[PDB]
Design a protein around this ligand. Structure first.
Ligand SMILES: *[C@@H]1O[C@H](CO[C@@H]2O[C@@H](C)[C@@H](O)[C@@H](O)[C@@H]2O)[C@@H](O[C@@H]2O[C@H](CO)[C@@H](O)[C@H](O)[C@H]2NC(C)=O)[C@H](O)[C@H]1NC(C)=O
Ligand SMILES: *[C@@H]1O[C@H](CO[C@@H]2O[C@@H](C)[C@@H](O)[C@@H](O)[C@@H]2O)[C@@H](O[C@@H]2O[C@H](CO)[C@@H](O)[C@H](O)[C@H]2NC(C)=O)[C@H](O)[C@H]1NC(C)=O
Lengths: 45, 45
């Protein structure tokens, strides 16, 4: 998402191929959610 | 990290210097981590 920009849906462009776009913020958010889950497990379980 | 882009390692450029590149996202993430650690520590005690 840093070297790409979004403009509309993908029903207009002719020849648009369709592949995963990586988002670092979501990756670190998921990692921190996993860390919080581990902390909660250490708290109760 | 917003001012600059990363390309390669430090063993190729002639004249590369020794300096910290500040990451605001990592700074706020570490602040959140410290806050959550203190929260859990005072919750346990
Ligand atoms: C490109 O995506 C199209 C659009 O489908 C969407 O994206 C897919 C990756 C998947 O998550 C779908 O559920 C999404 O709706 C894909 O075309 C789909 O093809 C499947 C298999 O026949 C069909 O069930 C869906 O209905 C199609 N989607 C639509 C909107 O008609 C296409 O497969 C993707 N390209 C590649 C190379 O996988
Ligand atoms: C630029 O710094 C690197 C590494 O950072 C230094 O060491 C850390 C442990 C920490 O104390 C930092 O603040 C320091 O700035 C230096 O790379 C080292 O170079 C030596 C000599 O060639 C080599 O033996 C080490 O393996 C290197 N270490 C790494 C991690 O690459 C580098 O030399 C510094 N630049 C200059 C001109 O001295």
């Amino acid at each position: 998402t840093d070297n790409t920009f979004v403009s509309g849906n993908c029903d207009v462009v002719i020849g648009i191929v369709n592949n995963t776009v990586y988002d670092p913020l979501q990756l670190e958010l998921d990692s921190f959610k996993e860390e919080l889950d581990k902390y909660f497990k250490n708290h109760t379980s």
